[PDB]
Amino acid sequence: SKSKLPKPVQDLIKMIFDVESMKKAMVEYEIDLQKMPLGKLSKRQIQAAYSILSEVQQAVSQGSSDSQILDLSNRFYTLIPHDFGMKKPPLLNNADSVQAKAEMLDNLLDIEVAYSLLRGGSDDSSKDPIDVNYEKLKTDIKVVDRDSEEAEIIRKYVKNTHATTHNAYDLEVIDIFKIEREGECQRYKPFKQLHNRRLLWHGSRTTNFAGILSQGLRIAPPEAPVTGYMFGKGIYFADMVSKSANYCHTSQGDPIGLILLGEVALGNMYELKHASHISKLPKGKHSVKGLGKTTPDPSANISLDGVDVPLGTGISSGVNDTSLLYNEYIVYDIAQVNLKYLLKLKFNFK
Numbered sequence: 188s189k190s191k192l193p194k195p196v197q198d199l200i201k202m203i204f205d206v207e208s209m210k211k212a213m214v215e216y217e218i219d220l221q222k223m224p225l226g227k228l229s230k231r232q233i234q235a236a237y238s239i240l241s242e243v244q245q246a247v248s249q250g251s252s253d254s255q256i257l258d259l260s261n262r263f264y265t266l267i268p269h270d271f272g273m274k275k276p277p278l279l280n281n282a283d284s285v286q287a288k289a290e291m292l293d294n295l296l297d298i299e300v301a302y303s304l305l306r307g308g309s310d311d312s313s314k315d316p317i318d319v320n321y322e323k324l325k326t327d328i329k330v331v332d333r334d335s336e337e338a339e340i341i342r343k344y345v346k347n348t349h350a351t352t353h354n355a356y357d358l359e360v361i362d363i364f365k366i367e368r369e370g371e372c373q374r375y376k377p378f379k380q381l382h383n384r385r386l387l388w389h390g391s392r393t394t395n396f397a398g399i400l401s402q403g404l405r406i407a408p409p410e411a412p413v414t415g416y417m418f419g420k421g422i423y424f425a426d427m428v429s430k431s432a433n434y435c436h437t438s439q440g441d442p443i444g445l446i447l448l449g450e451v452a453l454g455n456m457y458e459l460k461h462a463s464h465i466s467k468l469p470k471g472k473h474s475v476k477g478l479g480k481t482t483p484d485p486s487a488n489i490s491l492d493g494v495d496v497p498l499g500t501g502i503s504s505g506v507n508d509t510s511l512l513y514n515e516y517i518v519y520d521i522a523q524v525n526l527k528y529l530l531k532l533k534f535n536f537k
């Protein structure tokens with residue numbers, strides 16, 4: 188309203204700093220907001236909860252001392268307070284359950300970063316809250332024009348890598364933002380020397396984007412479980428928009444999601460057809476490529492700004508005996524990522 192920014196950037200700001208969305212996420216996790224309000228989330232409590240889920244997972248893998256598991260499960264729920272209403276707390280006693288609680292803590296941490304940013308500052312200004320909260324992201328955000336080559340390439344990227352199989356949605360690009368986080372340029376400069384820099388997708392929940400833009404994509408901490416990281420704790424990317432879009436966790440409820448395009452300096456790829464928890468790459472390798480059954484057609488590889496864009500249609504790869512439908516790319520150093528675009532997408536569920 189009293190803001191200098193174009194309306195798409197303003198709506199982006201409202202969307203990622205939306206306190207109702209934060210509380211709704213907590214309510215949907217069935218968190219007791221009387222015992223743990225949005226405003227009283229702590230990094231230290233969440234780090235301790237991460238550790239417990241790691242111990243839970245260890246206890247599962249060894250051989251359930253069924254009461255020590257229940258003792259760990261109870262300790263988790265004491266630390267992170269829940270209100271399940273009529274049902275009982277679901278026992279944390281398998282991999283899928285540990286992973287869901289870990290995803291919840293990831294979400295909670297970024298929500299806490301968003302809320303601390305929102306309440307931080309002096310809390311009185313001549314400028315309106317949109318411009319002021321825009322500033323706290325430490326990210327220059329510009330609208331890419333629909334009639335530019337970048338918008339066209341990016342829209343083609345979305346079109347061709349929308350996997351018309353197990354897709355319950357058509358995808359529509361509403362806005363394209365060009366983004367530059369403070370310090371990404373200098374942190375990334377050495378890695379610009381690596382060969383094989385690619386423009387790749389990274390999806391995440393909308394309530395995580397205030398944290399992602401202020402802090403960059405991060406690697407899960409040591410305390411957190413490794414369950415569900417097919418290739419260890421790193422930063423994950425796809426060359427198929429629908430693979431990453433699944434990580435937006437968008438529902439028929441909220442059919443709007445945010446997805447990143449990152450330039451990532453892959454270098455020599457450690458190529459793998461099966462899960463393998465990576466803690467250090469072999470010498471000479473700078474990334475992991477999970478080998479999918481379907482890969483973008485290399486004929487239609489193109490470039491913008493010297494970064495390769497694999498927007499080719501999904502064809503067959505020469506890889507039998509793989510656990511993966513689509514490729515994944517993983518780097519283990521945060522400085523190997525340069526976030527270049529942020530898309531607001533509408534999911535049209537069929």
Ligand SMILES: NC(=O)c1cc(F)cc2[nH]c(-c3cc4c(s3)CCNC4)nc12
Binds near residue numbers: 416430515516
């Ligand atoms: N975001 C992405 O675009 C993405 C793209 C991929 F090709 C593979 C991915 N794997 C993951 C994550 C795994 C886990 C998370 S995120 C939270 C904790 N439990 C495991 N994300 C991706």
